[PDB]
Amino acid sequence: AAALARLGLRAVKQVRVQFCPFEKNVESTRTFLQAVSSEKVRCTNLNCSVIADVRHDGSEPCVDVLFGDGHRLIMRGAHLTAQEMLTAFASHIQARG
Amino acid sequence: FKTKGVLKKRCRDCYLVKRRGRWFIYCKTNPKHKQRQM
Amino acid sequence: HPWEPGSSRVGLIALKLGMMPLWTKDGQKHVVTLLQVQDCHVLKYTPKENHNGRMAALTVGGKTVSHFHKSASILEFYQELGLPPKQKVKIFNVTENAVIKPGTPLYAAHFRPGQYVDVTAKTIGKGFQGVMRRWGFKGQPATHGQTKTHRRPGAISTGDVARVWPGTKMPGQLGNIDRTAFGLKVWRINTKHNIIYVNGSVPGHKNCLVKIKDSKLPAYKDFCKNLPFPTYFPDGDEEALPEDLYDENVCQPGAPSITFT
Amino acid sequence: SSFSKAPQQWATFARVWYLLDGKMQPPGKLAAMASVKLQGLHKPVYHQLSDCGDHVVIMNTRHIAFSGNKWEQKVYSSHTGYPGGFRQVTAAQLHQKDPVAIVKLAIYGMLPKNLHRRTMMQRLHLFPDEDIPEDILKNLVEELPQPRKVPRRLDEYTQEEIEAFPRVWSPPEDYRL
Amino acid sequence: TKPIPRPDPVHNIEETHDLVLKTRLEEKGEHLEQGPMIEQLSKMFFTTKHRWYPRGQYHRRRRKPNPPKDR
Amino acid sequence: FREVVEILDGKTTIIEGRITETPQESPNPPNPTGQCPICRWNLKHKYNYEDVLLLSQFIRPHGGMLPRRITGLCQEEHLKIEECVKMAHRAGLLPNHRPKLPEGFVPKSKPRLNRYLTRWSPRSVKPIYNKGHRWNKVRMPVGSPLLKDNVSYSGRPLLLYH
RNA sequence: AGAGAAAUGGGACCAACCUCACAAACGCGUCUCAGAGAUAAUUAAUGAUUUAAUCUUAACCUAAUUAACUCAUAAUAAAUCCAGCCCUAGAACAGGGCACA
RNA sequence: GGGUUUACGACCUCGAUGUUGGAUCAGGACACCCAAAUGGUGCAACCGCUAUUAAAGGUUCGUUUGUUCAACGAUUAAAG
Ligand SMILES: [Mg+2]
Ligand SMILES: [Mg+2]
Ligand SMILES: [Mg+2]
Ligand SMILES: [Mg+2]
Ligand SMILES: [Mg+2]
Ligand SMILES: [Mg+2]
Ligand SMILES: [Mg+2]
Ligand SMILES: [Mg+2]
Ligand SMILES: [Mg+2]
Ligand SMILES: [Mg+2]
Ligand SMILES: [Mg+2]
Ligand SMILES: [Mg+2]
Ligand SMILES: [Mg+2]
Ligand SMILES: [Mg+2]
Ligand SMILES: [Mg+2]
Ligand SMILES: [Mg+2]
Ligand SMILES: [Mg+2]
Ligand SMILES: [Mg+2]
Ligand SMILES: [Mg+2]
Ligand SMILES: [Mg+2]
Ligand SMILES: [Mg+2]
Ligand SMILES: [Zn+2]
Ligand SMILES: [Zn+2]
Secondary structure (H helix, E strand, O other), X not given: OHHHHHXXXXXXXXXXXXXXXXXXXXXXXXXXXXXXXXXXHHHHOOOOEEEEEEOOOOOOOEEEEEEOOOEEEEEEOOOOOHHHHHHHHHHHHHHOO | OEEEOOOXXXXXXXXXXXXXXXXXXXXXXXXHHOEEEO | OOOOOOOOOOOEXXXXXXXXXXXXXXXXXXXXXXXXXXXXXXXXXXXXXXXXXXXXXXXXXXXXXXXXXXXXXXXXXXXXXXXXXXXXXXXXXEOOOOOOOOOOEEOHHHOOOOEEEXXXXXXXXXXXXXXXXXXXXXXXXXXXXOOOOOOOOOOOOOOOOOOOOOOOOOOEEEOOOEEEEEEEEEEEXXXXXXXXXXXXXXXXXXXXXXXXXXXXXXXXXXXXXXXXXXXXXXXXXXXXXXOEEOOXXXXXXXXXXXXXX | OOOOHHHHHHHHOOOOEEEEEOOOOOHHHHHHHHHHHHHOOOOOOOOOOOOOOOEEEEEOOOOOEEEOOHHHHOEEEEEOOOOOOEEEEEHHHHHHHOHHHHHHXXXXXXXXXXXXXXXXXXXXXXXXXXXXXXXXXXXXXXXXOOOOOOOOOOOOOOHHHXXXXXXXXXXXXXXXX | OOOOOOOOOOOOOOOOOHHHXXXXXXXXXXXXXXXXXXXHHHHHHOOOOOOOOOOOHHHHHOOOOOOXXXX | OEEEEEEEOOOOEEEEEXXXXXXXXXXXXXXXXXXXXXXXXXXOOOOOOOOHHXXXXXXXXXXOEOOHHHHOOOHHHHHHHHXXXXXXXXXXXXXXXXXXXXXXXXXXXXXXXXXXXXXXXXXXXXXXXXXXXXXXXXXXXXXXXXXXXXXXXXXXXXXXXX
């Protein structure tokens, strides 16, 4: 979470993580959710909206990040590592932001 | 840079790297902590 | 063949007449040397693969000499060529695109006013001279007590070496060696008498043969573009050049006596 | 066996031309057999006073191979005699300047330290690549074996042998290469 | 085995006079200096130039005129 | 094997994970009682820098080493295999395990010097100018010292310094 | 970063002055002086062992990079006539001339 | 770690290894003065201080003292 805290996340509008807690590949998804919902990310910018969608029969975790460059980053993370998702999101928002 | 025979970190930000056949204590916070094993 | 950026041109073999002054339009005064191109003929042509593997070689002969003092082989070569024997025979390394048929004469109009050249010749051989005149070593004082040491070189080596090093400067032959001066600018080109005015000192005594070539300095490597690439052919243009080709800064003999403003 | 004296002597002390490939070969192991064949220590009729010597043609000299980091550690120091003319050329720089010089100096060192060294060196022929004139090629008799077995690359192995070589470990599917 | 090569070509034969054509290939000669001769001999026999030089009286006197022979 | 696929569709990046099929271990190991892979396949003190088929089982397509926690090897053999992989890469084996750069493959350089059994890096060793005398000799190291316990069919010890 | 000027030293020559009662010698006088590679120390690009980072006694290509040191380039680089007479060529020996006059 | 001053022992020479300073000639080493590329500074810039790599080239002219040294005058990029 320190990476997203020091990267200046002021340039994001909405981050939603849609998942189902009763699946078998939600570890990295919930890790990413906590890393983006940490207190430092919140204190970096207060205008952002963090949403955690919880379902039971979706069976497909996903992350949608809409930011004001007219950009929509969609990551269907079902087998990717939480660290890989975090570093990819960081590189993308640092390249376009 | 300081050429020494025994390198040692001076703060928690110095990292030891093996380069050019020697050891180098590199510090980004305090640049005066740059040490090189002779 | 057309001119190329990585191409070179053949040189000449002239006769050093003497020295003269030459005033520039800015009021300055330079010293020129007169080189007379008496007879320049391409004797033989050696191919690139047969000479160096990188550049072809052209053989150039100097002025005319007598048949009654050359050997059988040289006279046979000149008989098969159809030309009288030459005194000095030199080799010029040129590219494979600037080759000329052997037996072709060359003229001092080969160069144009404003250019840099190189000059090679044997300097004035002063014979077996002392070290003070050869290398410039300082001598000992004259009369403060020195006995038979007014011009000795002194110590020649050290003690523990128990010998002298091969590069030790010592009295020996001085002067008779092929030396080359680079980057000499040419001012005036006389077409009638085939005289070239080369700036600066030219190594070699007067009335001697001198090998002139294009300046191989890196600052003047691509200056052969506006000049005639193969050589100066007086029959190709069907036009006679002026008597004296002056540079853009040489104060010509006929001048309005320029004054500053 | 029942030859005349002159042809028997000629066949006994005849000279032989050998071939030696130096591609991916150590200069030491090359110069070993090179000096052996030069001195003639492969003939039971060898003697010091006799001039029994054979010619060796070493090809693919530029493609020589040094073991270890000698390419950057080993130096070849020469001196022109003049003061300050003491040059120390790295092995790589010397090989880049002249590809023959490496194996030439190796053989010149492995040969004995007598006057016959120049004589038996004049019988040596070293070529950087496989560009041998015909008058030299038509002299070869046989080719000596390579002293070092050249190891295969990964793409040089056949797929049947690749599948014959068993898999040691079972990688998990969740990992990313 | 491989067959025996046999090369036979006398290009000096002229249709005008065979008596002259026979001598055209026999009157060939060449004379060089000591240096070039020694160099060519060394290049031919794959030796150095130090062997082809002659020797002195002190060594040419001490050679045994009638050396023993075995067999 | 897991692969990260990225799709660019109108300022919208789609990053997805794709799992492919990976080959499994051979069915019959010669010594199933060993815990370590090499120690149970009885390849201990058997592999070398020449054995490419064994070293190529666990290396990233870009020549990288595979982590020990995922491989499963004992520490000593892992270090030995790392040394062997470094030596093979320096020697010139594994040609298909280099990163593809179409911009850098065009400007060819001086030819790669043929080397093998190299210990250090080609760009980190200074040439010996003193070279020492017979009693004090600066020995030139060749090969890794970790492989001194290989089986010697000739019986002579391996010259680690020459 | 861009223009010039000078000195030292390497190598040369008398158009003028200076030494100068030989036609030459000489400085105090005049002319010229260079392209490429490589690096040691030190920076950054990608990247694993250590799924992050990290200039790498981890590979593959990377780039600004001390002087040396080599190489482009230049100098010599047409062999078997030499009695005699000259030479800005020379101790002797060598070398260049003796046809325009 | 080096053998640059003094001393230590007297191993080589006392049927001879001629002894300090200067003139000429310098060769070599780097434990680098300048010139070249850098790191760190209580480095704001000019001046500075130290460390690394680098030896192709240089390291002045005078008064006094026989002086090596030593003080002073004028400079240089420096007077190792
Ligand atoms: Mg003279
Ligand atoms: Mg005087
Ligand atoms: Mg007296
Ligand atoms: Mg007296
Ligand atoms: Mg006197
Ligand atoms: Mg001695
Ligand atoms: Mg000068
Ligand atoms: Mg005078
Ligand atoms: Mg990474
Ligand atoms: Mg960083
Ligand atoms: Mg060269
Ligand atoms: Mg003569
Ligand atoms: Mg002493
Ligand atoms: Mg003592
Ligand atoms: Mg004694
Ligand atoms: Mg005594
Ligand atoms: Mg005595
Ligand atoms: Mg010196
Ligand atoms: Mg140093
Ligand atoms: Mg400096
Ligand atoms: Mg010096
Ligand atoms: Zn620090
Ligand atoms: Zn194990």
